Amino acid sequence: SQIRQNYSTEVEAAVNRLVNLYLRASYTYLSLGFYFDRDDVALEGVCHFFRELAEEKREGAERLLKMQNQRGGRALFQDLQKPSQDEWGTTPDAMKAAIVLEKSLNQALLDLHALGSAQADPHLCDFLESHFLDEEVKLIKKMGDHLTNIQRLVGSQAGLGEYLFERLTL
Amino acid sequence: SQIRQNYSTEVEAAVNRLVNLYLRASYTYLSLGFYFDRDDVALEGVCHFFRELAEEKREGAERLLKMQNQRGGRALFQDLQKPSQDEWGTTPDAMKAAIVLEKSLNQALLDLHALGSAQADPHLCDFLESHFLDEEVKLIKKMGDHLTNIQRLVGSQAGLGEYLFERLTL
Amino acid sequence: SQIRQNYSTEVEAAVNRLVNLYLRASYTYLSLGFYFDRDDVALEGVCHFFRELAEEKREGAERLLKMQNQRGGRALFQDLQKPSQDEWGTTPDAMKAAIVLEKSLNQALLDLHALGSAQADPHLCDFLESHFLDEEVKLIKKMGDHLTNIQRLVGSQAGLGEYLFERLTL
Amino acid sequence: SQIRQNYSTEVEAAVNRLVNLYLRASYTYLSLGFYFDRDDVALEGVCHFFRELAEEKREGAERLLKMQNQRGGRALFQDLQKPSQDEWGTTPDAMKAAIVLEKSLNQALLDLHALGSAQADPHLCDFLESHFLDEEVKLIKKMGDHLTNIQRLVGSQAGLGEYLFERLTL
């Protein structure tokens, strides 16, 4: 590469793996969104919450891909595994799964940061901090807040509580 | 007829019957709407939902009538049967009845399409596809979504759940 | 399903397979776009052409998914295979591959139309005609036009011809 | 110094050296720009590309100087060496030299980052990341893209390819 400078093969590979992880996350959210669009589930707030997250994750993958190219690495794509469920249960089930997923992304970002810091790659470490790390923290807090509110509600009376959350928060 | 071309007497008759079916559907929705306007029922959201459907069905009948004339057929009107109920129960009762009605309209459209396709009448087949078939599909999905939400709510606590649906969805 | 009407299990399955085919197509275009963004390839017109097609295909998948739900079918997702190449050669190589891909989508649409017509499913047949079939025809014509122009140019003098196409057409 | 806090003499000196390196880079770009303004070279796109980089580098030097003062260090200026060439050849020659120069700046930034990280100086490390490191990466990518395009073109037919690049990219 005519441009590549201070960009370890280890970081390049990990960036390609993270791209896979984000695209998988986008696919999981696509499936979550359409499940809540089913006529026998019918929570349009929840549907839109997860469809908007599908788009965020995709956009995360694309920004990683752009950076890869900016640093003179080579994008390499793998099979995208299907999501881990075909049916996603109730709103708390789905929000719990979303939080699990985000923690797995966040840990992958933290791992990749630690690798860049080992590799003395400050550009990478800035890039993650600027575009990914605080976004995850903010999103996980929001999901935490949602779960707490869903759990308050559906402890009370499940069907009613799930409706009211979708109506009045989402 | 000076205009009539490729327009079978079988399609003409079926169009006249479908016009009756839509006008009957509009009448059923008129009765549904005013029932929910009663002071001892008093769900204004539900009242407006069904009164707006009365108007849609009427407008369906008029578009069929216009097409009849465009193709050189003769509109022929029959008695309009009164709706099948005088009192329409609770919101889920009424939404169940609405879905039954729409499925009966949709099956009549599908039948008439099949007849036009037998009769090699592409104009008719386009006309139904453009103005009726997707509208029914969209409406039945919406009613399905509503029922699921009503059933979630009134499983919980019936009176409260019915109020909240009328307030927050309709 | 409370809504499902005239919607064969055969069409439902094929719709799920077509969703996979569109998402795979979007992934192929993602890879094409980022390849032309490489500093050692550096054709920004070509990059944008393929990235805009990634988005079109994704949006195709989502419209199929919405229809699935509208008809009372169940979305079911599979693994998304990685694209068939990691490096995509020159502009004519990439446009040839794109045309192959589109013909495969178009044949899948035509197959699914034929199935709906066997199954007497006019809604499906309209849906494809309205949102997919003419879009493919228009896109394949455009790609045909592009290839002819690329081939004229790079017959002449390859590097220069590829630059001028990216500059003056894309 | 009444303000100075956590600001090592080692960083202070290196900042003064980096200021020299940026001002030298601005001078090199000044010379590049006016060479392409010659009536016997006459590529106005190339002239403007390098004159705009002269200004960017100068502005880099001034931001380093401002930071020096913000941290309570003392700006110290040295002789500015003349650029390494009086005549800069063809467009690819000049873009190759520009890339060499930028890599030397980028390595100096990376060195200074590593020093701040040794010295536990997070302000410095942020300052570089925010104002310099991603700007270099973006600029080197752009120059890489340009070179690839220039090389495609002037492999074909040199004079023509150089004209077309200046016209249609710059």
XYZ file of C-alpha atoms in Angstrom:
680
model
C 0.000 0.000 0.000
C 1.132 3.472 -0.958
C -0.761 5.058 2.004
C -0.551 2.540 4.814
C 1.318 3.820 7.846
C 1.296 2.574 11.412
C -1.531 0.184 10.661
C -0.920 -3.322 11.962
C -2.214 -6.435 10.235
C -3.698 -7.332 13.622
C -5.860 -4.201 13.677
C -6.809 -4.631 10.045
C -8.097 -8.181 10.709
C -9.954 -7.158 13.875
C -11.602 -4.289 11.956
C -12.859 -6.795 9.381
C -14.288 -8.954 12.230
C -15.942 -5.965 13.850
C -17.545 -5.082 10.503
C -19.058 -8.626 10.531
C -20.258 -8.162 14.082
C -22.010 -4.858 13.243
C -23.628 -6.275 10.099
C -24.793 -9.260 12.109
C -26.199 -6.874 14.697
C -28.037 -4.963 11.962
C -29.523 -8.255 10.720
C -30.649 -9.215 14.234
C -32.389 -5.825 14.546
C -34.035 -6.223 11.109
C -35.521 -9.540 12.360
C -36.580 -7.951 15.692
C -38.285 -5.095 13.882
C -40.301 -7.238 11.517
C -41.341 -9.600 14.327
C -42.960 -6.653 16.168
C -44.661 -5.684 12.854
C -46.497 -9.045 12.773
C -50.288 -8.716 13.028
C -50.203 -11.070 16.008
C -47.600 -8.982 17.858
C -48.509 -5.488 16.581
C -46.334 -3.109 18.588
C -45.403 -0.343 16.098
C -43.257 1.579 18.593
C -41.120 -1.489 19.192
C -40.990 -2.232 15.476
C -39.633 1.310 14.799
C -37.154 1.168 17.721
C -35.487 -1.936 16.336
C -35.642 -0.899 12.672
C -33.854 2.356 13.553
C -31.182 0.342 15.359
C -30.739 -1.878 12.236
C -29.865 1.255 10.373
C -27.474 2.556 13.091
C -25.498 -0.722 13.111
C -25.301 -0.814 9.327
C -24.008 2.747 9.386
C -21.437 1.640 12.025
C -20.208 -1.137 9.648
C -19.883 1.406 6.805
C -17.879 3.835 8.856
C -15.487 0.995 9.856
C -15.217 0.046 6.194
C -14.413 3.619 5.225
C -11.747 3.808 7.900
C -10.237 0.505 6.788
C -9.777 2.046 3.313
C -8.549 5.382 4.750
C -5.755 3.489 6.565
C -4.856 1.350 3.582
C -6.295 -1.920 4.882
C -8.336 -4.345 2.815
C -11.998 -4.974 3.566
C -12.766 -8.686 3.634
C -16.270 -9.903 4.075
C -17.554 -13.146 5.584
C -20.863 -15.019 5.746
C -23.391 -13.191 7.920
C -24.918 -15.576 10.371
C -28.627 -15.449 10.741
C -29.977 -14.040 13.993
C -30.126 -16.294 17.013
C -33.923 -16.381 17.197
C -36.788 -16.525 14.659
C -39.376 -15.249 17.233
C -38.500 -12.700 19.868
C -41.123 -13.073 22.607
C -42.454 -10.053 24.461
C -41.081 -6.515 24.716
C -38.885 -7.288 27.758
C -37.529 -10.429 26.062
C -36.561 -8.368 23.036
C -35.011 -5.519 25.063
C -32.990 -8.021 27.107
C -31.658 -9.576 23.909
C -30.834 -6.095 22.535
C -28.852 -5.299 25.668
C -26.925 -8.576 25.404
C -26.100 -7.720 21.800
C -24.961 -4.200 22.575
C -22.740 -5.391 25.431
C -21.115 -7.807 22.959
C -20.501 -4.993 20.497
C -19.190 -2.723 23.249
C -16.791 -5.428 24.467
C -15.565 -5.885 20.895
C -14.924 -2.118 20.647
C -13.082 -2.178 23.981
C -11.007 -5.150 22.796
C -10.111 -3.380 19.566
C -9.189 -0.264 21.495
C -6.892 -2.290 23.739
C -5.282 -3.805 20.607
C -4.717 -0.362 19.077
C -3.262 0.860 22.301
C -0.876 -2.162 22.365
C -0.033 -1.509 18.725
C 0.553 2.238 19.466
C -2.160 3.252 16.941
C -3.610 6.583 18.246
C -5.635 7.188 15.097
C -7.592 3.978 15.696
C -8.011 4.774 19.362
C -9.404 8.240 18.555
C -11.661 6.874 15.788
C -13.323 4.435 18.210
C -13.681 7.018 20.942
C -15.175 9.609 18.624
C -17.667 7.399 16.741
C -18.440 4.249 18.744
C -17.607 4.152 22.427
C -19.865 6.977 23.735
C -22.643 5.993 21.326
C -22.673 2.510 22.867
C -22.625 3.832 26.393
C -25.578 6.181 25.571
C -27.504 3.389 23.872
C -26.998 0.862 26.634
C -28.157 3.433 29.217
C -31.312 4.087 27.160
C -32.012 0.323 26.908
C -31.431 -0.059 30.623
C -33.917 2.751 31.276
C -36.454 1.076 28.913
C -36.113 -2.316 30.565
C -36.613 -0.896 34.017
C -39.760 0.830 32.777
C -41.056 -2.233 30.899
C -40.422 -4.381 34.024
C -42.278 -1.956 36.297
C -45.222 -2.049 33.914
C -45.507 -5.746 33.120
C -45.039 -6.786 36.688
C -48.293 -4.868 37.167
C -50.493 -6.383 34.354
C -48.522 -7.701 31.360
C -50.665 -6.967 28.298
C -51.749 -3.556 29.499
C -48.201 -2.616 30.604
C -46.749 -3.597 27.235
C -49.304 -1.532 25.355
C -48.732 1.502 27.557
C -44.975 1.338 27.138
C -45.259 1.190 23.372
C -47.743 4.021 23.358
C -46.214 6.349 25.860
C -42.461 5.838 25.737
C -41.877 4.517 22.253
C -73.522 -0.564 -26.803
C -71.401 1.621 -29.034
C -68.384 1.375 -26.643
C -68.533 -2.103 -25.171
C -65.533 -4.238 -26.050
C -64.231 -7.382 -24.408
C -66.682 -7.023 -21.557
C -68.532 -10.231 -20.752
C -72.089 -10.310 -19.453
C -70.699 -12.481 -16.655
C -68.349 -9.729 -15.477
C -71.031 -7.095 -15.855
C -73.407 -9.057 -13.573
C -70.693 -9.788 -10.999
C -69.775 -6.075 -10.944
C -73.401 -5.239 -10.140
C -73.324 -7.808 -7.275
C -70.067 -6.427 -5.941
C -71.585 -2.927 -5.955
C -74.370 -4.355 -3.707
C -71.813 -5.966 -1.442
C -69.879 -2.686 -1.003
C -73.043 -0.665 -0.357
C -74.123 -3.265 2.170
C -70.705 -3.005 3.787
C -71.053 0.785 3.952
C -74.449 0.357 5.646
C -73.010 -2.095 8.187
C -70.278 0.446 9.017
C -72.844 3.275 9.326
C -74.676 1.138 11.944
C -71.385 0.273 13.722
C -70.410 3.929 13.873
C -73.658 5.171 15.343
C -73.743 2.337 17.896
C -70.377 3.528 19.290
C -71.812 7.100 19.354
C -74.540 5.996 21.806
C -74.301 7.690 25.215
C -74.220 4.249 26.820
C -71.314 3.065 24.649
C -69.473 6.382 24.124
C -66.263 5.451 22.321
C -65.668 8.353 19.882
C -62.503 6.836 18.398
C -64.389 3.687 17.468
C -67.316 5.719 16.170
C -64.951 7.655 13.823
C -63.091 4.491 12.712
C -66.286 2.877 11.482
C -67.820 6.043 10.015
C -64.668 6.562 7.926
C -64.951 2.975 6.698
C -68.625 3.600 5.706
C -67.351 6.315 3.457
C -64.511 4.175 1.991
C -66.936 1.368 1.044
C -69.399 3.798 -0.502
C -66.556 5.273 -2.525
C -65.615 1.696 -3.582
C -69.209 1.141 -4.866
C -69.038 4.419 -6.836
C -65.770 3.563 -8.482
C -67.214 0.164 -9.550
C -70.259 1.976 -10.902
C -68.081 4.373 -12.869
C -66.114 1.489 -14.321
C -69.297 -0.358 -15.260
C -70.294 2.703 -17.334
C -66.752 3.138 -18.736
C -66.930 -0.438 -20.102
C -70.431 -0.061 -21.471
C -72.195 -2.225 -18.889
C -75.472 -1.340 -17.217
C -75.650 -0.602 -13.504
C -78.505 -2.483 -11.866
C -79.325 -1.948 -8.261
C -80.928 -4.306 -5.748
C -82.422 -4.052 -2.258
C -79.750 -3.342 0.352
C -80.103 -5.730 3.215
C -79.942 -4.269 6.642
C -76.853 -5.056 8.697
C -76.681 -8.363 10.503
C -76.807 -6.862 13.994
C -78.662 -3.956 15.663
C -76.163 -3.814 18.611
C -72.484 -4.497 18.161
C -71.154 -5.420 21.611
C -67.710 -4.321 22.734
C -64.756 -3.028 20.716
C -63.319 -6.517 20.059
C -66.754 -7.805 19.002
C -67.042 -4.969 16.510
C -63.486 -5.361 15.157
C -64.024 -9.109 14.721
C -67.192 -8.435 12.738
C -65.342 -5.826 10.628
C -62.647 -8.364 9.806
C -65.253 -10.956 8.799
C -66.842 -8.369 6.521
C -63.583 -7.337 4.909
C -62.586 -10.957 4.266
C -65.943 -11.410 2.502
C -65.307 -8.360 0.346
C -61.749 -9.479 -0.382
C -62.951 -12.951 -1.409
C -65.515 -11.333 -3.708
C -62.737 -9.240 -5.311
C -60.581 -12.354 -5.721
C -63.529 -14.207 -7.276
C -64.174 -11.372 -9.707
C -60.503 -11.264 -10.600
C -60.535 -14.990 -11.328
C -63.617 -14.461 -13.545
C -61.907 -11.653 -15.471
C -58.850 -13.771 -15.893
C -61.030 -16.638 -17.255
C -62.798 -14.156 -19.512
C -59.411 -12.722 -20.697
C -60.358 -9.214 -19.448
C -57.027 -7.509 -18.498
C -58.655 -4.120 -17.992
C -60.840 -5.544 -15.219
C -57.918 -7.383 -13.693
C -55.822 -4.189 -13.605
C -58.737 -2.112 -12.261
C -59.157 -4.453 -9.273
C -55.446 -4.637 -8.591
C -54.990 -0.885 -8.750
C -58.005 0.201 -6.659
C -59.198 -2.664 -4.446
C -56.896 -5.590 -3.814
C -53.991 -3.827 -2.013
C -56.409 -1.540 -0.165
C -58.118 -4.614 1.295
C -54.857 -6.257 2.221
C -53.704 -3.018 3.980
C -57.025 -2.649 5.775
C -57.197 -6.229 6.966
C -53.627 -5.966 8.315
C -54.575 -2.791 10.222
C -57.670 -4.516 11.694
C -55.580 -7.521 12.634
C -53.113 -5.220 14.402
C -56.023 -3.475 16.223
C -57.573 -6.736 17.370
C -54.310 -8.028 18.734
C -53.912 -4.784 20.668
C -57.526 -4.731 21.901
C -57.169 -8.393 23.017
C -53.942 -7.697 24.913
C -55.663 -4.831 26.697
C -59.032 -6.332 27.580
C -57.546 -9.572 28.733
C -55.914 -7.337 31.347
C -58.970 -5.341 32.661
C -61.796 -4.950 30.122
C -63.273 -1.493 30.733
C -59.931 0.168 31.297
C -58.340 -1.599 28.289
C -61.169 -0.526 25.994
C -60.888 3.090 27.077
C -57.123 3.119 26.620
C -57.342 1.648 23.141
C -59.861 4.245 22.047
C -57.802 7.011 23.562
C -54.346 5.999 22.533
C -54.645 4.126 19.252
C -57.849 5.460 17.776
C -53.286 -16.239 11.205
C -56.264 -13.972 11.702
C -55.505 -12.031 8.457
C -54.085 -14.579 6.054
C -56.208 -15.075 2.959
C -55.300 -16.577 -0.387
C -51.651 -16.747 0.570
C -50.055 -20.101 -0.179
C -47.278 -21.598 1.918
C -45.394 -21.947 -1.369
C -45.447 -18.191 -1.977
C -44.595 -17.460 1.630
C -41.459 -19.657 1.428
C -40.393 -18.218 -1.936
C -40.805 -14.684 -0.531
C -38.449 -15.593 2.318
C -35.903 -16.909 -0.251
C -36.214 -13.788 -2.362
C -35.577 -11.666 0.744
C -32.291 -13.636 1.158
C -31.419 -13.081 -2.475
C -31.947 -9.295 -2.205
C -29.956 -9.038 1.032
C -27.184 -11.048 -0.577
C -27.302 -8.694 -3.545
C -27.042 -5.701 -1.205
C -23.983 -7.299 0.431
C -22.347 -7.925 -2.956
C -22.881 -4.244 -3.837
C -21.472 -3.112 -0.458
C -18.282 -5.092 -1.284
C -18.186 -3.686 -4.856
C -18.539 -0.145 -3.560
C -15.767 -0.353 -1.007
C -13.421 -2.051 -3.490
C -13.726 0.984 -5.812
C -13.058 3.227 -2.755
C -9.620 1.608 -2.275
C -6.714 4.031 -2.751
C -5.281 1.664 -5.351
C -8.523 1.561 -7.361
C -9.867 5.075 -6.647
C -12.922 5.431 -8.874
C -15.399 7.471 -6.770
C -18.142 7.407 -9.414
C -18.075 3.621 -9.462
C -17.923 3.488 -5.676
C -21.111 5.641 -5.456
C -22.910 3.666 -8.209
C -22.532 0.411 -6.313
C -23.178 1.864 -2.849
C -26.478 3.310 -4.107
C -27.400 -0.115 -5.476
C -26.619 -1.700 -2.048
C -29.233 0.576 -0.619
C -31.805 -0.160 -3.383
C -31.512 -3.937 -2.835
C -31.796 -3.577 0.927
C -34.908 -1.480 0.413
C -36.236 -4.239 -1.915
C -35.737 -6.835 0.894
C -37.607 -4.573 3.350
C -40.551 -4.083 1.065
C -40.804 -7.891 0.599
C -40.644 -8.279 4.368
C -43.414 -5.739 4.847
C -45.568 -7.520 2.299
C -44.934 -10.883 3.946
C -46.363 -9.411 7.179
C -49.228 -7.656 5.334
C -50.321 -11.056 3.944
C -49.951 -12.860 7.243
C -46.824 -14.837 6.365
C -43.855 -15.299 8.664
C -40.476 -13.791 7.843
C -37.696 -16.332 8.277
C -34.119 -15.340 7.854
C -31.125 -17.416 6.772
C -27.340 -17.023 6.729
C -26.241 -14.407 4.198
C -23.503 -15.790 2.049
C -20.542 -13.592 1.493
C -20.108 -12.150 -1.988
C -18.540 -14.308 -4.654
C -15.392 -12.204 -5.000
C -13.096 -10.291 -2.604
C -11.610 -8.141 -5.453
C -13.677 -6.985 -8.385
C -11.200 -6.161 -11.161
C -11.780 -3.236 -13.493
C -14.936 -1.232 -14.193
C -16.134 -3.564 -16.985
C -15.496 -6.624 -14.791
C -17.618 -5.094 -12.054
C -20.436 -4.000 -14.397
C -20.535 -7.474 -15.962
C -20.867 -9.031 -12.513
C -23.619 -6.518 -11.621
C -25.547 -7.482 -14.740
C -25.227 -11.189 -13.915
C -26.562 -10.458 -10.439
C -29.493 -8.408 -11.661
C -30.476 -11.064 -14.208
C -30.514 -13.585 -11.339
C -32.759 -11.328 -9.286
C -35.013 -10.666 -12.272
C -35.340 -14.401 -12.973
C -36.239 -14.962 -9.319
C -38.955 -12.276 -9.589
C -40.264 -13.874 -12.790
C -40.285 -17.289 -11.093
C -42.190 -15.922 -8.115
C -44.657 -14.236 -10.430
C -45.246 -17.517 -12.247
C -45.824 -19.211 -8.857
C -48.350 -16.556 -7.817
C -50.092 -16.887 -11.113
C -50.279 -20.702 -10.627
C -51.513 -20.141 -7.085
C -54.126 -17.582 -8.332
C -52.625 -14.831 -6.110
C -53.315 -11.508 -7.950
C -52.164 -9.393 -5.019
C -48.684 -10.920 -5.238
C -48.634 -10.570 -8.996
C -49.547 -6.866 -8.764
C -47.048 -6.253 -5.937
C -44.169 -7.596 -8.055
C -45.248 -5.712 -11.146
C -45.642 -2.434 -9.300
C -42.421 -2.489 -7.235
C -39.874 -4.857 -8.794
C -40.323 -5.950 -12.381
C -40.063 -2.565 -14.189
C -37.345 -1.396 -11.794
C -35.230 -4.395 -12.814
C -35.871 -3.873 -16.489
C -34.867 -0.159 -16.154
C -31.762 -1.036 -14.160
C -30.581 -3.755 -16.501
C -31.008 -1.395 -19.480
C -28.915 1.256 -17.688
C -26.176 -1.321 -16.927
C -26.255 -2.502 -20.516
C -25.830 1.098 -21.684
C -22.905 1.567 -19.224
C -21.140 -1.589 -20.350
C -21.395 -0.660 -23.991
C -19.893 2.727 -23.162
C -17.151 1.293 -20.923
C -16.276 -1.249 -23.671
C -16.065 1.442 -26.355
C -13.728 3.419 -24.123
C -11.390 0.734 -22.816
C -11.002 -0.887 -26.171
C -9.444 2.467 -27.073
C -6.907 2.935 -24.176
C -7.886 1.169 -20.935
C -6.711 3.443 -18.114
C -7.749 6.633 -19.845
C -11.130 5.169 -20.908
C -11.900 4.029 -17.368
C -11.105 7.438 -15.928
C -13.226 9.222 -18.517
C -16.207 6.973 -17.905
C -16.065 7.564 -14.174
C -15.686 11.276 -14.685
C -18.163 11.895 -17.425
C -20.926 9.327 -17.054
C -20.798 8.433 -13.392
C 5.610 29.801 34.356
C 2.513 30.646 36.343
C 0.313 28.354 34.156
C 2.518 25.438 33.198
C 1.275 22.115 34.515
C 2.113 18.601 33.407
C 4.033 19.897 30.424
C 7.434 18.280 30.007
C 10.434 20.090 28.568
C 10.692 17.138 26.182
C 7.240 17.813 24.728
C 7.877 21.534 24.596
C 11.054 21.008 22.514
C 9.390 18.476 20.202
C 6.494 20.914 19.653
C 8.997 23.569 18.568
C 10.556 21.049 16.112
C 7.168 20.076 14.745
C 6.374 23.765 14.183
C 9.572 23.908 12.038
C 8.530 20.807 10.151
C 5.077 22.253 9.332
C 6.510 25.614 8.254
C 9.013 23.789 6.083
C 6.157 21.783 4.605
C 4.251 24.999 3.878
C 7.341 26.379 2.107
C 7.710 23.211 0.018
C 4.053 23.546 -1.043
C 4.515 27.257 -1.877
C 7.366 26.226 -4.241
C 5.272 23.367 -5.720
C 2.367 25.713 -6.353
C 4.358 28.378 -8.137
C 6.189 25.785 -10.254
C 2.824 24.587 -11.648
C 1.926 28.274 -12.294
C 4.899 28.615 -14.686
C 3.881 29.342 -18.289
C 5.884 26.303 -19.374
C 4.105 23.984 -16.920
C 0.661 25.653 -16.796
C -1.495 23.307 -14.730
C -3.775 25.642 -12.712
C -5.540 22.805 -10.878
C -2.223 21.508 -9.590
C -1.081 25.022 -8.738
C -4.236 25.544 -6.589
C -3.968 22.089 -4.946
C -0.489 22.825 -3.645
C -1.145 26.465 -2.725
C -4.107 25.357 -0.589
C -1.855 22.821 1.131
C 0.725 25.596 1.850
C -1.990 27.361 3.739
C -3.128 24.211 5.630
C 0.427 23.502 6.859
C 0.952 27.102 7.921
C -2.311 26.930 9.839
C -1.053 23.669 11.446
C 2.134 25.493 12.628
C 0.003 28.307 14.108
C -2.237 25.965 16.011
C 0.859 24.231 17.492
C 2.222 27.644 18.424
C -1.030 28.590 20.122
C -1.027 25.346 22.066
C 2.590 25.846 23.114
C 1.530 29.178 24.674
C -1.669 27.678 26.162
C 0.485 25.111 28.021
C 3.052 27.640 29.156
C 5.861 26.554 26.836
C 8.092 28.920 24.903
C 7.982 29.079 21.117
C 11.471 28.987 19.638
C 11.996 29.370 15.959
C 14.784 28.044 13.742
C 16.015 28.608 10.186
C 13.550 27.252 7.629
C 15.356 25.126 5.128
C 14.537 25.709 1.537
C 12.576 22.990 -0.237
C 14.436 19.977 -1.535
C 13.831 20.748 -5.208
C 13.735 23.912 -7.365
C 11.757 22.151 -10.183
C 9.138 19.536 -9.468
C 8.751 17.526 -12.682
C 5.365 16.248 -13.791
C 2.118 15.865 -11.846
C 2.940 12.329 -10.625
C 6.433 13.441 -9.554
C 4.907 16.242 -7.514
C 2.178 14.063 -5.955
C 4.767 11.432 -5.006
C 6.863 14.096 -3.292
C 3.747 15.421 -1.498
C 2.987 11.944 -0.193
C 6.562 11.521 1.057
C 6.250 14.846 2.860
C 2.925 14.018 4.455
C 4.181 10.630 5.661
C 7.094 12.468 7.314
C 4.708 14.857 9.033
C 2.428 12.004 10.080
C 5.370 10.064 11.542
C 6.412 13.180 13.460
C 2.864 13.481 14.871
C 2.896 9.793 15.828
C 6.296 10.241 17.495
C 5.064 13.240 19.458
C 1.973 11.328 20.495
C 4.124 8.464 21.753
C 6.222 10.996 23.724
C 3.114 12.535 25.301
C 1.835 9.126 26.167
C 5.206 8.287 27.827
C 5.102 11.629 29.615
C 1.460 10.988 30.737
C 0.255 14.169 28.951
C -3.399 13.469 27.920
C -4.015 17.056 26.853
C -1.283 16.780 24.217
C -2.523 13.390 23.112
C -6.075 14.725 22.660
C -4.846 17.885 20.895
C -3.008 15.819 18.261
C -5.888 13.421 17.787
C -8.442 16.189 17.422
C -6.521 18.505 15.058
C -3.786 16.578 13.230
C -3.934 12.806 13.135
C -7.235 12.276 11.235
C -6.508 15.244 8.965
C -3.268 13.557 7.887
C -4.925 10.216 7.362
C -7.659 11.891 5.209
C -5.087 13.852 3.226
C -2.817 10.907 2.559
C -5.811 8.855 1.354
C -6.791 11.674 -1.035
C -3.204 11.871 -2.384
C -3.120 8.114 -2.781
C -6.378 8.274 -4.746
C -4.937 11.096 -6.934
C -1.733 9.214 -7.668
C -3.576 6.088 -8.677
C -5.689 8.179 -11.039
C -2.722 10.138 -12.434
C -0.838 6.833 -12.991
C -3.779 5.247 -14.815
C -3.957 8.284 -17.073
C -0.305 8.904 -17.886
C 0.418 5.278 -18.487
C -2.083 5.746 -21.318
C -0.692 8.928 -23.048
C 1.262 11.247 -20.727
C 0.488 14.788 -21.900
C -3.168 14.101 -22.542
C -3.577 12.197 -19.240
C -2.005 15.029 -17.257
C -4.279 17.609 -18.839
C -7.380 15.517 -18.216
C -6.512 14.968 -14.574
C -6.018 18.669 -13.987
C -9.225 19.474 -15.789
C -11.499 16.809 -14.464
C -10.322 15.955 -10.964
C -8.558 19.095 -9.848
